[PDB]
Design a protein around this ligand. Structure first.
Ligand SMILES: N[C@@H](Cc1c[nH]c2ccccc12)C(=O)O
Ligand SMILES: N[C@@H](Cc1c[nH]c2ccccc12)C(=O)O
Ligand SMILES: [Ca+2]
Ligand SMILES: [Zn+2]
Ligand SMILES: [Zn+2]
Length: 273
């Protein structure tokens, strides 16, 4: 896999921050900052050669969108998916929650094209709408994916909050092959991980698609033991600005964002061979 350039990921976050500022301070479902987020991500993907789909739904009286990006080629009967919700809550720009996951997934999809990669499995990336309303966009996608296409899914990888300023390194304990691929990447860095103990992998998991993912923590408090193994501040939240107006460009730990973006690409390459 390539090394995902941290600066490229950070630059997507800067664009999402500007989009929030230009649209009432947020990127929330039913508000213009969400669709403007979608348009930015879509234009990058289209220019890199993806076949993109805007999947529209209505929730709460307002139009929502999922953005689906298929990399042409690969075995149609073995599809590997990776995704991240692209909506924020309306209190702020949602840069860690979940610009961080959205930017890592986008930069990994751009890296495929830059590398001239031809994965054996077909790759499909997704940016979900309306996750903050209760997984509405990912539930819509799974509910509208015919069973014949569901059965073609080899896995779904989810990235929701991966740049927390006081981070832990959590790996979902779901499908064993996906979990081992992420833990192998962190082992090469000599960075320990813990099992993740309510995001867009749930609708996939619940219909038997193998899932996994990465998370750096939200409102819970970092323990003494976690500060000893990962650094940071014991007794403070992993993300002190969770769902807050302060979930801004300042609310990112660059090392966590870099490690989780690189791990995302590692798993996507490994699992699509
Ligand atoms: N889905 C949550 C974030 C979150 C909290 N705890 C998690 C555990 C795993 C994955 C995601 C989470 C949100 O968007 O605010
Ligand atoms: N995100 C920076 C820390 C930081 C907070 N606010 C900043 C403003 C400018 C530059 C860096 C920062 C890091 O992870 O090291
Ligand atoms: Ca990197
Ligand atoms: Zn989230
Ligand atoms: Zn959230």
């Amino acid at each position: 896999a390539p090394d995902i350039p941290l600066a490229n990921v950070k630059a997507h976050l800067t664009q999402l921050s500007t989009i929030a500022a230009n649209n009432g301070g947020n990127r929330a479902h039913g508000r213009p900052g969400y669709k403007a987020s979608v348009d930015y991500v879509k234009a990058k993907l289209d220019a890199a050669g993806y076949t993109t789909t805007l999947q529209q739904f209505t929730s709460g009286g307002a139009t929502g969108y999922n953005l689906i990006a298929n990399w042409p080629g690969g075995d149609p009967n073995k599809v590997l998916m990776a995704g991240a919700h692209l909506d924020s809550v309306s209190s702020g720009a949602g840069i860690n929650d979940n610009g961080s996951g959205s930017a890592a997934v986008l930069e990994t999809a751009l890296a495929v094209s830059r590398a001239g990669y031809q994965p054996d499995k077909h790759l499909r990336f997704a940016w979900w709408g309306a996750e903050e309303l209760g997984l509405i966009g990912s539930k819509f996608y799974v509910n509208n994916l015919p069973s014949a296409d569901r059965s073609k899914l080899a896995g779904y990888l989810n990235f929701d909050m991966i740049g927390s300023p006081n981070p832990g390194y959590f790996v979902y304990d779901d499908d064993p092959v996906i979990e081992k691929t992420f833990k192998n990447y962190f082992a090469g860095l000599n960075v320990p991980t813990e099992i993740e103990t309510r995001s867009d992998h749930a609708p996939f998991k619940n219909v038997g698609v193998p899932v996994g993912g990465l998370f750096t923590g939200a409102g819970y408090t970092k323990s003494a033991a976690q500060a000893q193994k990962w650094g940071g501040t014991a007794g403070q939240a992993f993300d002190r600005c969770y769902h807050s107006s302060c979930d801004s460009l300042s609310n990112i730990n660059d090392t966590a964002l870099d490690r989780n973006s690189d791990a995302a690409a590692h798993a996507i390459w490994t699992l699509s061979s």
